[PDB]
Design a protein around this nucleic acid. Sequence first.
RNA 1: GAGCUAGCCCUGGCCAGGGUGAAGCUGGGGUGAGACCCAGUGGAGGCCCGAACCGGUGGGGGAUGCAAACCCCUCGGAUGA
RNA 2: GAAUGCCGGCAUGAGUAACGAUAAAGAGGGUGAGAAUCCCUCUCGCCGUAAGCCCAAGGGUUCCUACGCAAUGGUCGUCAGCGUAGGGUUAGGCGGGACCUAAGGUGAAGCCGAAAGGCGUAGCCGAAGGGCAGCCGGUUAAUAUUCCGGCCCUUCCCGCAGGUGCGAUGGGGGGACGCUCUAGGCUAGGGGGACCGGAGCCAUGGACGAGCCCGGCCAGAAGCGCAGGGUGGGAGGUAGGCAAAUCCGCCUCCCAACAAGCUCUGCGUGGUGGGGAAGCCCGGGUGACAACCCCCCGAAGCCAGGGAGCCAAGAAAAGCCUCUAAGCACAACCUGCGGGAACCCGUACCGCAAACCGACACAGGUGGGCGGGUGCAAGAGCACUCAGGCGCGCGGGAGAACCCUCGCCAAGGAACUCUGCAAGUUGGCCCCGUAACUUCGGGAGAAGGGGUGCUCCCUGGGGUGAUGAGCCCCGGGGAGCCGCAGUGAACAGGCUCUGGCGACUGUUUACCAAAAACACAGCUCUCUGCGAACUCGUAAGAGGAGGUAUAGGGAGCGACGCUUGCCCGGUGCCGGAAGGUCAAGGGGAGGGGUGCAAGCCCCGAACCGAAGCCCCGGUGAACGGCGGCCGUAACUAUAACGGUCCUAAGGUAGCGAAAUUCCUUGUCGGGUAAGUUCCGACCUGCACGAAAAGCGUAACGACCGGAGCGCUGUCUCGGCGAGGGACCCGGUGAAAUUGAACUGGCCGUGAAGAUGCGGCCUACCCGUGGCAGGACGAAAAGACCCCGUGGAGCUUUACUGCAGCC
RNA 3: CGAUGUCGGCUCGUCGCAUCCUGGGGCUGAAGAAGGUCCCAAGGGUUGGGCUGUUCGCCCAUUAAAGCGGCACGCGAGCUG
RNA 4: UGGGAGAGGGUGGUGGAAUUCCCGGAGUAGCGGUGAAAUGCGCAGAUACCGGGAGGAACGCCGAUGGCGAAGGCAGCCACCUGGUCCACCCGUGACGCUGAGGCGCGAAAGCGUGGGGAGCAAACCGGAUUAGAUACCCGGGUAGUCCACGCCCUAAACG
RNA 5: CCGAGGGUAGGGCCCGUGACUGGGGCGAAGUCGUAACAAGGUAGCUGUACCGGAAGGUGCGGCUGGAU
Lengths: 48, 275
Amino acid sequence: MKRTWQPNRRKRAKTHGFRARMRTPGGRKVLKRRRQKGRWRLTPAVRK
Amino acid sequence: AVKKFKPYTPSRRFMTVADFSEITKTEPEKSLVKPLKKTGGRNNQGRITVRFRGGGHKRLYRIIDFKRWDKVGIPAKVAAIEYDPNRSARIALLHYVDGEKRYIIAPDGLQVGQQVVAGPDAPIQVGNALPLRFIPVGTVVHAVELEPKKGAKLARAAGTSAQIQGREGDYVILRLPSGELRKVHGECYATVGAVGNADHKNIVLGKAGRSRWLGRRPHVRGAAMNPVDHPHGGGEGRAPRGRPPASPWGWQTKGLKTRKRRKPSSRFIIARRKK
RNA sequence: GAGCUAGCCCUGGCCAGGGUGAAGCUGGGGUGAGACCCAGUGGAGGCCCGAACCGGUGGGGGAUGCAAACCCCUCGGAUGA
RNA sequence: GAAUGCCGGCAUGAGUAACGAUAAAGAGGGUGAGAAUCCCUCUCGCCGUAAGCCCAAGGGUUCCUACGCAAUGGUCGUCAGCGUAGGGUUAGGCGGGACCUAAGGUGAAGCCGAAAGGCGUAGCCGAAGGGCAGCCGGUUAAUAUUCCGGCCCUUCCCGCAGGUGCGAUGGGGGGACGCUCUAGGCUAGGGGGACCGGAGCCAUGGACGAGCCCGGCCAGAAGCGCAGGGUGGGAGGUAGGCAAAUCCGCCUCCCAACAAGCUCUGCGUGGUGGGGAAGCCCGGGUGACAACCCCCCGAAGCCAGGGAGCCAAGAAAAGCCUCUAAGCACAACCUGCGGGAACCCGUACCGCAAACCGACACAGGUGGGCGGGUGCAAGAGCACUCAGGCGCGCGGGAGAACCCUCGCCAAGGAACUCUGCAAGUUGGCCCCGUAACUUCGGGAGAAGGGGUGCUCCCUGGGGUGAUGAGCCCCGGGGAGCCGCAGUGAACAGGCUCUGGCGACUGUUUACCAAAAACACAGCUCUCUGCGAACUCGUAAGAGGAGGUAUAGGGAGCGACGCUUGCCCGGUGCCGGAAGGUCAAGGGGAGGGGUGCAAGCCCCGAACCGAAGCCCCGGUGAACGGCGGCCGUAACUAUAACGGUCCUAAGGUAGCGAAAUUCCUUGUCGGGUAAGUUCCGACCUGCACGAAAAGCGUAACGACCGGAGCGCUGUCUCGGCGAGGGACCCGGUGAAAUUGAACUGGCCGUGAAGAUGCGGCCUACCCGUGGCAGGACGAAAAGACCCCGUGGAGCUUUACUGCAGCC
RNA sequence: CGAUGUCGGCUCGUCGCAUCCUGGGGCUGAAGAAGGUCCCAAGGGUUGGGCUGUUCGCCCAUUAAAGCGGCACGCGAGCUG
RNA sequence: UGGGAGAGGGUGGUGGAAUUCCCGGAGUAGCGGUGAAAUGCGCAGAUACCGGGAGGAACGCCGAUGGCGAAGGCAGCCACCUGGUCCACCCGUGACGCUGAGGCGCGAAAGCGUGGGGAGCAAACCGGAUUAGAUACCCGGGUAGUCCACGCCCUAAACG
RNA sequence: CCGAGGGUAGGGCCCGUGACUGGGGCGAAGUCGUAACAAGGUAGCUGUACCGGAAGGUGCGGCUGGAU
Ligand SMILES: [Mg+2]
Ligand SMILES: [Mg+2]
Ligand SMILES: [Mg+2]
Ligand SMILES: [Mg+2]
Ligand SMILES: [Mg+2]
Ligand SMILES: [Mg+2]
Ligand SMILES: [Mg+2]
Ligand SMILES: [Mg+2]
Ligand SMILES: [Mg+2]
Ligand SMILES: [Mg+2]
Ligand SMILES: [Mg+2]
Ligand SMILES: [Mg+2]
Ligand SMILES: [Mg+2]
Ligand SMILES: [Mg+2]
Ligand SMILES: [Mg+2]
Ligand SMILES: [Mg+2]
Ligand SMILES: [Mg+2]
Ligand SMILES: [Mg+2]
Ligand SMILES: [Mg+2]
Ligand SMILES: [Mg+2]
Ligand SMILES: [Mg+2]
Ligand SMILES: [Mg+2]
Ligand SMILES: [Mg+2]
Ligand SMILES: [Mg+2]
Ligand SMILES: [Mg+2]
Ligand SMILES: [Mg+2]
Ligand SMILES: [Mg+2]
Ligand SMILES: [Mg+2]
Ligand SMILES: [Mg+2]
Ligand SMILES: [Mg+2]
Ligand SMILES: [Mg+2]
Ligand SMILES: [Mg+2]
Ligand SMILES: [Mg+2]
Ligand SMILES: [Mg+2]
Ligand SMILES: [Mg+2]
Ligand SMILES: [Mg+2]
Ligand SMILES: [Mg+2]
Ligand SMILES: [Mg+2]
Ligand SMILES: [Mg+2]
Ligand SMILES: [Mg+2]
Ligand SMILES: [Mg+2]
Ligand SMILES: [Mg+2]
Ligand SMILES: [Mg+2]
Ligand SMILES: [Mg+2]
Ligand SMILES: [Mg+2]
Ligand SMILES: [Mg+2]
Ligand SMILES: [Mg+2]
Ligand SMILES: [Mg+2]
Ligand SMILES: [Mg+2]
Ligand SMILES: [Mg+2]
Ligand SMILES: [Mg+2]
Ligand SMILES: [Mg+2]
Ligand SMILES: [Mg+2]
Ligand SMILES: [Mg+2]
Ligand SMILES: [Mg+2]
Ligand SMILES: [Mg+2]
Ligand SMILES: [Mg+2]
Ligand SMILES: [Mg+2]
Ligand SMILES: [Mg+2]
Ligand SMILES: [Mg+2]
Ligand SMILES: [Mg+2]
Ligand SMILES: [Mg+2]
Ligand SMILES: [Mg+2]
Ligand SMILES: [Mg+2]
Ligand SMILES: [Mg+2]
Ligand SMILES: [Mg+2]
Ligand SMILES: [Mg+2]
Ligand SMILES: [Mg+2]
Ligand SMILES: [Mg+2]
Ligand SMILES: [Mg+2]
Ligand SMILES: [Mg+2]
Ligand SMILES: [Mg+2]
Ligand SMILES: [Mg+2]
Ligand SMILES: [Mg+2]
Ligand SMILES: [Mg+2]
Ligand SMILES: [Mg+2]
Ligand SMILES: [Mg+2]
Ligand SMILES: [Mg+2]
Ligand SMILES: [Mg+2]
Ligand SMILES: [Mg+2]
Ligand SMILES: [Mg+2]
Ligand SMILES: [Mg+2]
Ligand SMILES: [Mg+2]
Ligand SMILES: [Mg+2]
Ligand SMILES: [Mg+2]
Ligand SMILES: [Mg+2]
Ligand SMILES: [Mg+2]
Ligand SMILES: [Mg+2]
Ligand SMILES: [Mg+2]
Ligand SMILES: [Mg+2]
Ligand SMILES: [Mg+2]
Ligand SMILES: [Mg+2]
Ligand SMILES: [Mg+2]
Ligand SMILES: [Mg+2]
Ligand SMILES: [Mg+2]
Ligand SMILES: [Mg+2]
Ligand SMILES: [Mg+2]
Ligand SMILES: [Mg+2]
Ligand SMILES: [Mg+2]
Ligand SMILES: [Mg+2]
Ligand SMILES: [Mg+2]
Ligand SMILES: [Mg+2]
Ligand SMILES: [Mg+2]
Ligand SMILES: [Mg+2]
Ligand SMILES: [Mg+2]
Ligand SMILES: [Mg+2]
Ligand SMILES: [Mg+2]
Ligand SMILES: [Mg+2]
Ligand SMILES: [Mg+2]
Ligand SMILES: [Mg+2]
Ligand SMILES: [Mg+2]
Ligand SMILES: [Mg+2]
Ligand SMILES: [Mg+2]
Ligand SMILES: [Mg+2]
Ligand SMILES: [Mg+2]
Ligand SMILES: [Mg+2]
Ligand SMILES: [Mg+2]
Ligand SMILES: [Mg+2]
Ligand SMILES: [Mg+2]
Ligand SMILES: [Mg+2]
Ligand SMILES: [Mg+2]
Ligand SMILES: [Mg+2]
Ligand SMILES: [Mg+2]
Ligand SMILES: [Mg+2]
Ligand SMILES: [Mg+2]
Ligand SMILES: [Mg+2]
Ligand SMILES: [Mg+2]
Ligand SMILES: [Mg+2]
Ligand SMILES: [Mg+2]
Ligand SMILES: [Mg+2]
Ligand SMILES: [Mg+2]
Ligand SMILES: [Mg+2]
Ligand SMILES: [Mg+2]
Ligand SMILES: [Mg+2]
Ligand SMILES: [Mg+2]
Ligand SMILES: [Mg+2]
Ligand SMILES: [Mg+2]
Ligand SMILES: [Mg+2]
Ligand SMILES: [Mg+2]
Ligand SMILES: [Mg+2]
Ligand SMILES: [Mg+2]
Ligand SMILES: [Mg+2]
Ligand SMILES: [Mg+2]
Ligand SMILES: [Mg+2]
Ligand SMILES: [Mg+2]
Ligand SMILES: [Mg+2]
Ligand SMILES: [Mg+2]
Ligand SMILES: [Mg+2]
Ligand SMILES: [Mg+2]
Ligand SMILES: [Mg+2]
Ligand SMILES: [Mg+2]
Ligand SMILES: [Mg+2]
Ligand SMILES: [Mg+2]
Ligand SMILES: [Mg+2]
Ligand SMILES: [Mg+2]
Ligand SMILES: [Mg+2]
Ligand SMILES: [Mg+2]
Ligand SMILES: [Mg+2]
Ligand SMILES: [Mg+2]
Ligand SMILES: [Mg+2]
Ligand SMILES: [Mg+2]
Ligand SMILES: [Mg+2]
Ligand SMILES: [Mg+2]
Ligand SMILES: [Mg+2]
Ligand SMILES: [Mg+2]
Ligand SMILES: [Mg+2]
Ligand SMILES: [Mg+2]
Ligand SMILES: [Mg+2]
Ligand SMILES: [Mg+2]
Ligand SMILES: [Mg+2]
Ligand SMILES: [Mg+2]
Ligand SMILES: [Mg+2]
Ligand SMILES: [Mg+2]
Ligand SMILES: [Mg+2]
Ligand SMILES: [Mg+2]
Ligand SMILES: [Mg+2]
Ligand SMILES: [Mg+2]
Ligand SMILES: [Mg+2]
Ligand SMILES: [Mg+2]
Ligand SMILES: [Mg+2]
Ligand SMILES: [Mg+2]
Ligand SMILES: [Mg+2]
Ligand SMILES: [Mg+2]
Ligand SMILES: [Mg+2]
Ligand SMILES: [Mg+2]
Ligand SMILES: [Mg+2]
Ligand SMILES: [Mg+2]
Ligand SMILES: [Mg+2]
Ligand SMILES: [Mg+2]
Ligand SMILES: [Mg+2]
Ligand SMILES: [Mg+2]
Ligand SMILES: [Mg+2]
Ligand SMILES: [Mg+2]
Ligand SMILES: [Mg+2]
Ligand SMILES: [Mg+2]
Ligand SMILES: [Mg+2]
Ligand SMILES: [Mg+2]
Ligand SMILES: [Mg+2]
Ligand SMILES: [Mg+2]
Ligand SMILES: [Mg+2]
Ligand SMILES: [Mg+2]
Ligand SMILES: [Mg+2]
Ligand SMILES: [Mg+2]
Ligand SMILES: [Mg+2]
Ligand SMILES: [Mg+2]
Ligand SMILES: [Mg+2]
Ligand SMILES: [Mg+2]
Ligand SMILES: [Mg+2]
Ligand SMILES: [Mg+2]
Ligand SMILES: [Mg+2]
Ligand SMILES: [Mg+2]
Ligand SMILES: [Mg+2]
Ligand SMILES: [Mg+2]
Ligand SMILES: [Mg+2]
Ligand SMILES: [Mg+2]
Ligand SMILES: [Mg+2]
Ligand SMILES: [Mg+2]
Ligand SMILES: [Mg+2]
Ligand SMILES: [Mg+2]
Ligand SMILES: [Mg+2]
Ligand SMILES: [Mg+2]
Ligand SMILES: [Mg+2]
Ligand SMILES: [Mg+2]
Ligand SMILES: [Mg+2]
Ligand SMILES: [Mg+2]
Ligand SMILES: [Mg+2]
Ligand SMILES: [Mg+2]
Ligand SMILES: [Mg+2]
Ligand SMILES: [Mg+2]
Ligand SMILES: [Mg+2]
Ligand SMILES: [Mg+2]
Ligand SMILES: [Mg+2]
Ligand SMILES: [Mg+2]
Ligand SMILES: [Mg+2]
Ligand SMILES: [Mg+2]
Ligand SMILES: [Mg+2]
Ligand SMILES: [Mg+2]
Ligand SMILES: [Mg+2]
Ligand SMILES: [Mg+2]
Ligand SMILES: [Mg+2]
Ligand SMILES: [Mg+2]
Ligand SMILES: [Mg+2]
Ligand SMILES: [Mg+2]
Ligand SMILES: [Mg+2]
Ligand SMILES: [Mg+2]
Ligand SMILES: [Mg+2]
Ligand SMILES: [Mg+2]
Ligand SMILES: [Mg+2]
Ligand SMILES: [Mg+2]
Ligand SMILES: [Mg+2]
Ligand SMILES: [Mg+2]
Ligand SMILES: [Mg+2]
Ligand SMILES: [Mg+2]
Ligand SMILES: [Mg+2]
Ligand SMILES: [Mg+2]
Ligand SMILES: [Mg+2]
Ligand SMILES: [Mg+2]
Ligand SMILES: [Mg+2]
Ligand SMILES: [Mg+2]
Ligand SMILES: [Mg+2]
Ligand SMILES: [Mg+2]
Ligand SMILES: [Mg+2]
Ligand SMILES: [Mg+2]
Ligand SMILES: [Mg+2]
Ligand SMILES: [Mg+2]
């Protein structure tokens, strides 16, 4: 059938992108946490 | 005269459509339409706050001249009678001798080719807008302001009317379409005549489709739901209400009066409504 | 988290083909005028048959599957909610 | 040493199942260490509204080439979407940006919120919508509307010439719009040609032919030609388009109005630039100076912003035009010409799939365009085929049971069975004909029949053209021919009668329920006078609605027809300016503490004191409720009739052994050989009943019953046959499970059902194909049941709070 | 209770005998035929249908007869459901 | 041709009396009702009186034993639209007439549908009385409906 | 070819009969009430509507075939 993952570059960056995270308090804490843990990537890779 | 159809489908059996015998112009006035933005019953938080809304035909909003005290003593001609999908009434297009063009909602008996006028001096004739204090007692009237200069507010649905019962001070006594008696200020404007298209109540939507066309999504009985959804939820099988009939939200839907008791317009409601 | 799913909003798109043949219209009849009658034209419809498309009724298979819901035969809707 | 322990390692099942659509293969010749699997050829089969082609999204080098075969590939591998390396994506015109706005988002003004933050007009952002300038061919191993050739065009700058009141975010016009149906004329595409060009071919009995086979075009600037769209012209007045305004809007007059005039498109032609087959011979070359013409069909695309009808009434903004304001009229704009200038990003390749979503090269999912011919009424259906693309990444045998998918069947014909489940029957078309009932539409494809091929002959209309021929779409008549049989293959209804339930088309438990459930028009009650009620939110603010009682919220009922009875005592709701009860507060008889005293401090009775409750009313399509015993008629039986107890009132109409009836398969009737079901009745209704509606109701239904016809492998009752498996050989090689096992039967015994204990019987060791009685077989720490002072959803006149409202 | 799948059916049997039939008998209110009752006897046999989910039961038409029980109310790693 | 009478019909308008209701004042222990009662209503201020307002229907006197119409039937007043009818004059046509199966139209009340309306009245229904009972007559309430529009129904002691 | 007739399917008319149900007629001495005939103790009849064990009652409109 139709599965759950239907990639969509515009959707990916607009929902999980760096700018979507920076806007909201909970977004920044995300970026702060993943920085504290040391993630190589702070948001999903999406081609644009 | 509302039109019937032969029973050549189950739904055509009872379905009735308006006569449209009064419409003279079949496309609107481009200078007087806006995009009427459909909500779907969703507020600015995006929440369904009014239920069972959405999905109806696309519409343009016809700007309607609900003041008319803009243009005192300027005669306008009735150039057309047009279909408006935003209200039950029909609308009339006014070419003012000014050159200015406006829509008013069309009273009953109004004819393309005649002339209307707004102001304290206007003849007491169908389509003229006057302050309330100058309209003679007893004349039916529509498009009635409720507070001076705040815009026509009452008797704007098709077929409806208001009647000037008496005078008292700076106030006139109106029998609104609901049969209540209220005080409205005399400087409030009102328009001579009832609203046209009374046959509107006699329309039979004939099938569920036309309801969906009007933006009316299917209403679900509370009895049919589950208790997490509604006071009438559940039961094994069908079930009487088994408690005072309640809305989805708890309050009692039978009888329970709901107007504010301390509302300042109480000093101006003379009598609650009828039937 | 609404890239699944539910509903709505904005903007686009899709619906082979055949069948039935509403109103109206014209003529003709009828009449005091009407109603109504007949033929033709007309092409209405949550109309009819049926692909695409949308479904998922019955049965069989499948059952460490081709598949964590599939396959085959059958069947429902297919201009409309 | 056990924790269904944790991490790892390695066993068992086992050389077992399997190796992923039953579209299918065979051979020759290559290559190489090695070949069913790579390359080439010939033959065969498969898709062909796809299984071919072109976009989009997503993927991100996977593309092309050389070089490879450890791993990946379900086998093999010399091959590869794999490994190493090199190469490869070229734009003013294609798409996107330097343009436009949509929902939405954001957000100077502003508003609100303990903080975080929430709002919000403008404006900004935001696209597959609007706007905008490139078509044809050639070329690379791989990019091409991008490179190149040919012919076109756009904007910016600057110059020149001519013209003009120039000038904009300002004003206006325009952009600018639905649905069904649709004309005229074209184009896309297709069919035929006895005409035109072509390498040839003559077979196996005939044919040297009006024979066969192939092909007969594409793009094109201005002019012109055909077809369309858009479009009044002038004048005077003018108070409106938030300044202005010759524009626009409004009024008056002459004028031009099926016209035309102008302009804008499509189509054709068009200098010119290309293309060009089979076949033959190494993608090449030839063919070839290739020819490139005629007739027909003909779009759903184009002209287009076309026409008509309809109701549910069908975006915005920019471009573009027009108007003027500051300004400036040495400027500026317009037209024409010339030169110059013209940026960023994407472009490989896959793309119904082995490259995307599904952990897999996974029978699943994925939006748009093109989708050729013949025949079958039509069609994108079906069969077969073109172009093109494939044979599905294990094979070779054998020809058991059994399994799946499939074909047939003597006689019977539902006897099968929970049920004709399933499978038959029927099957398109044309014609004849067609019932109850009905809301007059329908029921209807009702039912049931006849026809259907081919040849010859005679003919009616329609389309093109010309009014003829030809082509072409519908027919009609007559005489015939063949077969078992002419929708000869493929696609393509079984019918009926009768109940129940729901009016109907719709909707639903994604992944066990499609239903009688939801919904539905329609009916009623109730709330709401607008800063509405109601909803969401702390609020601001939103929705409601830019709506106004013919409207909007809530609730039940559920088309329609005929209907909808009695009870307001209780609960609710509604009304009630009295009475009663009632908090804070007021009031202050009177006491209390303390101080030498003024004082300070405390307690405090009467009485005034809202809402709510009490009380008085109303109210049922508000929550609900609608009796018991005894007796009585001149056969009996039974009670129209009476007696009395109780109630707030004792169930009306209609219906009833029912989707409800317990006794129950009630009784009687019909159907049947036989009928716990069915239908029709009766009425002692355990326990129908009137908008949780009551009784009906045409039509509808993948709903649930009962009967009949047809026809059958469902059955008596099975038989044979087909292929895919199972089986055997070569290759790859899992799984749950598993205390260890050297694991028989009986009768006993044992924690009460023993391979394992006792006694007896039986039994050489080890396999293979099979079947399932046991291993209280396996997967699952029973979901039933109970227990836990475990949990959660839900309820209410349980308790206690809180939101909200008063 | 870290699961012993539960009605009925179908399929496949097998066992018991307190015997439905068939075979041998005694007694009889056994004349014959035909029965009744009891004794021996498990070898074999013990049908097809309508109703119901039914086991059962009732019925139809037959029959030599239309036996009754056990086998985890035999039998779902055999099917149905 | 010229006149006359008439509630003949249709539409729109509009006048006053009375009833109920609402509002203000004023006023108090009962009103109402019957054969007598009671239900009912009234100190939460009724009845009785004054002023005010809304709404409906029906039109007193005139009114008659009258008029009109085909019958059903039609009654405040105004205007519009329209039928019949009668009379005078003796002008016109020249038997054009009578009836009338069928057909068509009209047709009290009640009733039916869809809107509206709703004062008073009132089937049904409820209550109080009466009675052996009283599903009645009598009393207090009261829903259709009576009324408007359109469309049905087509009955009658539709009678002279 | 026509053709008695036979078969298949679907209609229309008629008759008989059917559990049960609807009223109707008639039947020496049943039960209930008293509706009508007098003002029949509510004048009565009437068309219609609703209602009630039954006769009847009530509403509406009409008739006199009504009385004083
Ligand atoms: Mg899905
Ligand atoms: Mg996944
Ligand atoms: Mg998707
Ligand atoms: Mg995207
Ligand atoms: Mg995108
Ligand atoms: Mg997106
Ligand atoms: Mg973002
Ligand atoms: Mg976001
Ligand atoms: Mg911070
Ligand atoms: Mg890093
Ligand atoms: Mg990571
Ligand atoms: Mg992140
Ligand atoms: Mg209709
Ligand atoms: Mg009709
Ligand atoms: Mg109209
Ligand atoms: Mg605009
Ligand atoms: Mg809005
Ligand atoms: Mg918003
Ligand atoms: Mg938001
Ligand atoms: Mg949110
Ligand atoms: Mg709501
Ligand atoms: Mg909504
Ligand atoms: Mg309108
Ligand atoms: Mg409205
Ligand atoms: Mg006011
Ligand atoms: Mg309505
Ligand atoms: Mg609408
Ligand atoms: Mg509903
Ligand atoms: Mg429910
Ligand atoms: Mg439920
Ligand atoms: Mg919830
Ligand atoms: Mg809750
Ligand atoms: Mg609740
Ligand atoms: Mg409930
Ligand atoms: Mg339920
Ligand atoms: Mg129940
Ligand atoms: Mg329920
Ligand atoms: Mg109820
Ligand atoms: Mg209850
Ligand atoms: Mg409640
Ligand atoms: Mg509330
Ligand atoms: Mg009111
Ligand atoms: Mg989130
Ligand atoms: Mg669309
Ligand atoms: Mg379609
Ligand atoms: Mg037809
Ligand atoms: Mg026709
Ligand atoms: Mg027409
Ligand atoms: Mg349809
Ligand atoms: Mg059909
Ligand atoms: Mg299925
Ligand atoms: Mg089947
Ligand atoms: Mg499964
Ligand atoms: Mg499938
Ligand atoms: Mg199929
Ligand atoms: Mg449908
Ligand atoms: Mg269909
Ligand atoms: Mg269709
Ligand atoms: Mg739609
Ligand atoms: Mg231990
Ligand atoms: Mg553990
Ligand atoms: Mg361990
Ligand atoms: Mg472990
Ligand atoms: Mg582990
Ligand atoms: Mg391990
Ligand atoms: Mg390790
Ligand atoms: Mg290992
Ligand atoms: Mg091994
Ligand atoms: Mg094995
Ligand atoms: Mg396996
Ligand atoms: Mg195998
Ligand atoms: Mg497999
Ligand atoms: Mg297949
Ligand atoms: Mg197959
Ligand atoms: Mg070969
Ligand atoms: Mg081979
Ligand atoms: Mg190989
Ligand atoms: Mg090899
Ligand atoms: Mg192969
Ligand atoms: Mg090869
Ligand atoms: Mg060969
Ligand atoms: Mg094809
Ligand atoms: Mg990938
Ligand atoms: Mg390898
Ligand atoms: Mg290898
Ligand atoms: Mg290597
Ligand atoms: Mg491998
Ligand atoms: Mg390998
Ligand atoms: Mg594989
Ligand atoms: Mg090699
Ligand atoms: Mg490349
Ligand atoms: Mg170019
Ligand atoms: Mg720049
Ligand atoms: Mg913060
Ligand atoms: Mg954005
Ligand atoms: Mg933008
Ligand atoms: Mg765009
Ligand atoms: Mg472009
Ligand atoms: Mg070009
Ligand atoms: Mg090209
Ligand atoms: Mg090269
Ligand atoms: Mg110059
Ligand atoms: Mg100029
Ligand atoms: Mg200018
Ligand atoms: Mg426009
Ligand atoms: Mg617009
Ligand atoms: Mg558009
Ligand atoms: Mg429409
Ligand atoms: Mg062309
Ligand atoms: Mg063709
Ligand atoms: Mg050309
Ligand atoms: Mg001028
Ligand atoms: Mg001016
Ligand atoms: Mg050459
Ligand atoms: Mg199309
Ligand atoms: Mg167009
Ligand atoms: Mg906008
Ligand atoms: Mg100046
Ligand atoms: Mg100058
Ligand atoms: Mg730049
Ligand atoms: Mg490219
Ligand atoms: Mg596919
Ligand atoms: Mg591929
Ligand atoms: Mg492909
Ligand atoms: Mg892959
Ligand atoms: Mg594969
Ligand atoms: Mg695949
Ligand atoms: Mg072709
Ligand atoms: Mg066909
Ligand atoms: Mg294959
Ligand atoms: Mg395939
Ligand atoms: Mg394979
Ligand atoms: Mg073998
Ligand atoms: Mg044969
Ligand atoms: Mg057979
Ligand atoms: Mg048979
Ligand atoms: Mg037969
Ligand atoms: Mg049967
Ligand atoms: Mg079943
Ligand atoms: Mg068949
Ligand atoms: Mg067929
Ligand atoms: Mg029949
Ligand atoms: Mg018929
Ligand atoms: Mg029938
Ligand atoms: Mg019927
Ligand atoms: Mg009919
Ligand atoms: Mg037929
Ligand atoms: Mg032949
Ligand atoms: Mg069919
Ligand atoms: Mg249904
Ligand atoms: Mg249902
Ligand atoms: Mg119904
Ligand atoms: Mg329904
Ligand atoms: Mg489900
Ligand atoms: Mg489920
Ligand atoms: Mg699930
Ligand atoms: Mg299912
Ligand atoms: Mg269900
Ligand atoms: Mg269904
Ligand atoms: Mg449902
Ligand atoms: Mg429902
Ligand atoms: Mg209804
Ligand atoms: Mg109502
Ligand atoms: Mg709230
Ligand atoms: Mg706060
Ligand atoms: Mg709004
Ligand atoms: Mg219904
Ligand atoms: Mg319901
Ligand atoms: Mg009560
Ligand atoms: Mg009460
Ligand atoms: Mg009460
Ligand atoms: Mg109080
Ligand atoms: Mg109760
Ligand atoms: Mg109860
Ligand atoms: Mg009743
Ligand atoms: Mg029963
Ligand atoms: Mg019964
Ligand atoms: Mg029965
Ligand atoms: Mg029943
Ligand atoms: Mg019951
Ligand atoms: Mg029973
Ligand atoms: Mg029985
Ligand atoms: Mg019988
Ligand atoms: Mg029955
Ligand atoms: Mg009985
Ligand atoms: Mg119920
Ligand atoms: Mg009820
Ligand atoms: Mg029924
Ligand atoms: Mg029915
Ligand atoms: Mg029916
Ligand atoms: Mg259905
Ligand atoms: Mg169904
Ligand atoms: Mg059945
Ligand atoms: Mg049957
Ligand atoms: Mg049969
Ligand atoms: Mg068989
Ligand atoms: Mg075989
Ligand atoms: Mg061997
Ligand atoms: Mg091997
Ligand atoms: Mg391997
Ligand atoms: Mg051991
Ligand atoms: Mg051992
Ligand atoms: Mg052993
Ligand atoms: Mg052994
Ligand atoms: Mg024991
Ligand atoms: Mg034992
Ligand atoms: Mg042993
Ligand atoms: Mg031992
Ligand atoms: Mg021992
Ligand atoms: Mg032993
Ligand atoms: Mg032993
Ligand atoms: Mg032994
Ligand atoms: Mg073996
Ligand atoms: Mg085996
Ligand atoms: Mg076993
Ligand atoms: Mg077994
Ligand atoms: Mg076992
Ligand atoms: Mg065990
Ligand atoms: Mg077992
Ligand atoms: Mg186990
Ligand atoms: Mg499990
Ligand atoms: Mg556990
Ligand atoms: Mg546990
Ligand atoms: Mg447990
Ligand atoms: Mg468990
Ligand atoms: Mg227990
Ligand atoms: Mg406790
Ligand atoms: Mg305890
Ligand atoms: Mg607990
Ligand atoms: Mg809890
Ligand atoms: Mg257990
Ligand atoms: Mg276990
Ligand atoms: Mg277990
Ligand atoms: Mg069987
Ligand atoms: Mg013997
Ligand atoms: Mg004897
Ligand atoms: Mg003897
Ligand atoms: Mg024996
Ligand atoms: Mg049985
Ligand atoms: Mg049993
Ligand atoms: Mg039984
Ligand atoms: Mg015998
Ligand atoms: Mg016998
Ligand atoms: Mg037994
Ligand atoms: Mg036992
Ligand atoms: Mg037992
Ligand atoms: Mg038992
Ligand atoms: Mg099983
Ligand atoms: Mg079983
Ligand atoms: Mg087992
Ligand atoms: Mg007092
Ligand atoms: Mg009123
Ligand atoms: Mg004379
Ligand atoms: Mg009448
Ligand atoms: Mg009447
Ligand atoms: Mg009483
Ligand atoms: Mg007495
Ligand atoms: Mg004959
Ligand atoms: Mg014969
Ligand atoms: Mg006596
Ligand atoms: Mg009487
Ligand atoms: Mg009497
Ligand atoms: Mg009398
Ligand atoms: Mg009397
Ligand atoms: Mg009465």
